[PDB]
Every structure is written in C-alpha cells, then in structure tokens.
From a paper:
The enzyme phospho­triesterase (PTE) is capable of hydrolyzing such OP compounds. Accordingly, it has been characterized from a number of bacterial sources, including Brevundimonas diminuta (Bd; formerly Pseudomonas diminuta), Flavobacterium spp. and Agrobacterium radiobacter. The present study focuses on Bd_PTE, a dimeric metallohydrolase that has a (β/α)8 TIM-barrel fold with two Zn2+ ions embedded in the active site. Carbon dioxide reacts with the side chain of Lys169 to form a carbamate functional group within the active site, which serves as a bridging ligand to the α-Zn2+ and β-Zn2+ ions, both of which are required for full catalytic activity. The buried α-Zn2+ ion is ligated to the protein via direct interactions with His55, His57 and Asp301, and the exposed β-Zn2+ ion interacts with His201 and His230.
The tag-free C23 variant was expressed without the MBP fusion tag and purified by conventional purification tech­niques. Crystals of C23_1 obtained from 10% PEG 6000, 15% MPD, 2% PEG 400, 0.1 M HEPES pH 7.5 diffracted to 3.2 Å resolution. Since the crystals diffracted so poorly, it was deemed to be unsuitable for use in OP co-crystallization experiments. C23_1 crystallized in space group P212121, with two dimers in the asymmetric unit. To avoid forming inactive PTE molecules containing less than two Zn2+ ions in the active site, it was crucial to add ZnCl2 during protein expression, purification and crystallization. All of the structures listed in Table 2, except for A53_1 and C23_1, were obtained using preparations in which the purification media were supplemented with ZnCl2, and indeed display molecular dimers with two Zn2+ ions in the active site of each monomer. A53_1 is presumably an inactive monomer with one Zn2+ ion in its active site and C23_1 diffracted to low resolution.
Author numbering:
A (entry chain B): 36 to 362
B (entry chain A): 35 to 362
Write the structure that this text describes.
Amino acid sequence: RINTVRGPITISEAGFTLTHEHICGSSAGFLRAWPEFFGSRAALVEKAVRGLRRARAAGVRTIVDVSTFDIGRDVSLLAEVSRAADVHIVAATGLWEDPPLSMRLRSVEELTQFFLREIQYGIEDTGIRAGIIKVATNGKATPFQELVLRAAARASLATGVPVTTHTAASQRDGEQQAAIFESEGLSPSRVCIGHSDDTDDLSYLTALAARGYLIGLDGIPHSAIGLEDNASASALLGNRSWQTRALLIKALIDQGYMKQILVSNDWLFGFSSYVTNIMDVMDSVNPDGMAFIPLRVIPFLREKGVSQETLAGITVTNPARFLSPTL
Amino acid sequence: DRINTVRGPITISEAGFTLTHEHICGSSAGFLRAWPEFFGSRAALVEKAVRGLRRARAAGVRTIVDVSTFDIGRDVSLLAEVSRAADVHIVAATGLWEDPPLSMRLRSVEELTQFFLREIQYGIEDTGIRAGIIKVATNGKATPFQELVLRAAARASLATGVPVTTHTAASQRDGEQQAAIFESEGLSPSRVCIGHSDDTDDLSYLTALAARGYLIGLDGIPHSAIGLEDNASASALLGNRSWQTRALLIKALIDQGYMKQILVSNDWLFGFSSYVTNIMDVMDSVNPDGMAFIPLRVIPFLREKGVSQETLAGITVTNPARFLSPTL
Ligand SMILES: [Zn+2]
Ligand SMILES: [Zn+2]
Ligand SMILES: [Zn+2]
Ligand SMILES: [Zn+2]
C-alpha cells in the first residue's frame, strides 16, 4: 500500500499514473517568502487545479510529485491541490541538483535518517509520508551526490519505497548511478533512471533496461523547437521534437522492454528555479499541461501500432508494481 | 526615526544597549521546519536561545539585530517568540548571505530590489513583520551575482532609509570592493557597516574605510580557536587570533579618532546547521558566556585598558541607534 498526500491507498486505486510531475519548480522557502513571484499563492493554486482537472478529465488518477526539499515541496499546497481536483498525489523525499549548506555538510549516516524521517515518520509537522526517493546527477557524481545515492539506497532498503533519479542522459549518467546503487545491494527493479528520453543512444537504454532497471521517458513534451529566438528556453528544453522522444517508447517496447517503461511529462505550473517568465514560454508550447500524455502521446502511439493492452500495462501496471513497497 | 523590531515598531530611545550582529540560528531556509530533530527539537532550540538571551539581558542588553537572511533560515515567528519570552528587542534582516539557492540566483537586480523592498516595506512572509536592515556578503573578488546583490541592496536602502550591514573576508580587503560598488550607486558610507573586520590586522585598511565615512563592525570578538589546533574544522571557522587581539582593535580604532564609526558584537548563535556536525558543541565551550561576552568580558577589559564609560556608552547605544534610524 502506497502513501499519498491525502493518506494511504491500495495498489489498484491508482489507475493511469504519471510518474514524474511537479506542481511548482522552486527552491526551499521561496514559495512562502516571495509568493508575489507567482502572482499570489492562490493565483498559482488555481493554475494547478485548472491544469490537474484537465488531466483528470483525461483519465489521470495519480501523479507522483518528485519535487524534493531543495525544490520547495510545499506538502500542504500539494494536498490542497489534490482535494480540489480529485487526483492522488504521491510526494517525494530526497535531494535534487541544488542542496543547501545545511544539507551538503551532512554524512551519509545523517542523510539516511532524514530520508527515513520523510518516509517512515512524516514530511515536516504535517504527518504526510513520501512514497518515492528522488536523487540527481549531471555527469560524474560529486562526492556529495555520491553520498545521496548511497543514503537513498540504504533508505530504499529499510522501507521498500523506490528511487527515481535525475540524469543528464547524453553522458550515460545512469551507468554510474546503477554502479553506485548496486554497490549498496539495491535491486534494479527499485530504481527508475529518469530524464532518459533526453538521449538518442538506444543501446545505453536497453543495456540499462536489461540489467533490470526502469526507464523514465519522463520528458515527452520538452521541446524548444519554435523557440529558436529564446536562448534560455532552448537550453532547458532541447532541440529534439516531442515525437522523437515519443517514438523511443515504441522502440523500447520493440526490444522487449515494455515491462520496464514509465512515461510522464515533467511538467509544472510554477517555475522559479530558472529565468523569469520561463513558465510563460513553456505554457505556449504545451497548453495541455500534464494532460499531454493522455491527449497527444497515447493517440500518437496507437497511430504507430501500440495496442491499448500494452499501453495500459505501461501506464497502470508498471507504476503499480513500481510504487508498491517491497522488502 | 522609529525602528521595526519583530514585535512591532519602537522608538530610537527604546533601543538601549544594542548588539549589531547576532544569530538565533545559523541554518538554511526551511531546514528548521523540515528536520527539527537535527536541533533536538524546535522546542529545544527555543529553550536554549531564550536562556542565552536572558543571560545577555541581565548583563544589560535590550536589543539585538539578528542578521540571518532568507538563506540563513530566518524564521521570524521563531524570532518573535524568543523576543516575547526574553524581553529583548529583535530587529530582523533581509538580503542574501553566502548561500543563495537557484530561485534567488537567477534573479535580476530589478527583481532582487522588488524582494528587498517587500521585506522592508510590506513584510517578511505572511507574518507582516518588517526588516530593519539589509545584509549582503562577499568573500574575495565579488562574483557577478554578488555585484547584483550589493547593487540591489544599495537601491533598497536609498529607497527606504534602512541600513546595509555586510559580511567580509577582512584579510582580503573586501571592504574596498564593496565600498566602490556602494558608492557607485549613490549610497552614503554612513548607511553601510563593513563587518567581520576584526578578522584582519591591517589597521590602515580599517582606517582608510572609516575615514571615507563607513562604520566598522567588530562583530566576532570571541571567535578564536586557541587551544583547538587539533580540530581543523574549528580552527578554520574561528581563526587563530585570540579574543584580546580583536578587542584591542576597538581601542586602536577609538584612538585613531573613529569612536563614532565603531559597532561591536559577538556573531554568536544557538543552533548551527550550516557547518559540520557538533560544531555547536565546540563553540559553546570556547565561550560559555555566549552573547553575554560583550557586556561581561569585553566591556570590563576595555575599561581596564582605560576607555571612558562615556565612550563605551556611545559605542553601544549612541552608535547603533544612529545606524538603525532610517534616513532618506
Ligand atoms: Zn529533473
Ligand atoms: Zn522533474
Ligand atoms: Zn558572517
Ligand atoms: Zn553572521
């Protein structure tokens, strides 16, 4: 049984499940401290609930919100949005690209206790528990990032919740990640290598798939084609098309790794950890928001020969098996 | 001429004896809320800061300026709570210290100015507590962003009248480069305390500034790791100059004639998460007085070296209150 922000639910209550989404991409404390940045706090919470409603109209029953502490995971703001839309939300624990000083100077012993705090006891005074552990690298692991992986693996072994990881896929990051993970004795089935549609090296994915790992093609609408005037927007979203990412799903089923795909949008309704008005530009690319998966990518795949049977396994069965704890 | 503490405004005269650089907690933003167990509990941290705050009250302190910014983890409801309990005025801080996260770092100088003025004019968070001072920092040659932070902090101060205090690596003559940016923005040296300057011995560097009109913050008087050379992490934080060696810098800056531009404080704290673990264990036994070290051990030291009580009173009451009075 899975922990959501509104309590525990059973495996089959989950349904069609986006497995890497954000409500707001921010920093810790930024939302409390400068909420005019997003218009107002209520201005943003409306923007999420409009956008979540649109996906729940499209069949989505659960999102996994992989914002960690250093992304500003306002776990109350989540459960606010989760009532008003009737979408389960699974919150995350862990650490992203930007930990603060009070994190960086901790030992792998200390980080393991904090990770188990938010899985076993609760995120802040709020009593909500996290069902997934997010971690991150961009290239070679820094010594701290190395600690984070081992602490998240030692956490994932006392609790059974899985690990999802941020990756710069162009530099075969999952390889080092999985090397570090397996050194701690974590089953490759308890780990999704994320941001993996950012590469075109299929051999790297299928090699990683074949050791047992789950592959996050969680970036399907991230494309800055049409924004070759925005320098920063092109940097954040890559020059590969959405169909280019989407086809890598079919290509990975073809190698007989349907059992191992998770698909998601990596969308967000507030974005402060990048240049200003980046959210202005991203919403014009993709008005559908988080609804881009059931409205545009599921039709596109049925148009390329993927039946409703295996689509339903990827969107319902795979996240169900992946989020259920396992000792 | 009123100043904003965390329990509403007060008048200049109400300030009294004032430590112009202190911390209740040295942390990062929401670290306290997220992992209170690192400090024992949120209760346990509040007990310990009130205890130390009453010890300094009984030695005669009324007002401390807690200069923790957003990224030192400035919990103003926490600060308001220990101000109620220990009957001590606490001025709160806006600005950006050594560790700004992504959502500040990507901001322009215009935006950062909108943010400082928000914490000065409107309030901090949803609490409606207003800041009385803008803290910024460099170590060495300013990063381009540190130039953006100094310039926006300077634009707020001209727009509001609140002073700017700073953190420096004194040994590298930072106050030279801070001052050049400040004065390039139209800001009066009277509005800027160049701090952490008892971490140098280059006396002519302090005097060169102080003549240009700046205030000089001697804000780490019991920082010294003497007798703690085997602890390499502690020796890095506190340095190897004893506390007498710093306390002399006061008397030596009085003498040069600059009694009016001298602010004195501890840079103490009751919870420290943004350094190695158990560093708070070490610091509390170097100095059991805590924030009381300036009334209890540095004041009697200076009178034995022959400073006039009328000069001491101006240093701790006339000097802070002139700094914190808003001036457009
Ligand atoms: Zn990511
Ligand atoms: Zn993400
Ligand atoms: Zn400092
Ligand atoms: Zn300080």
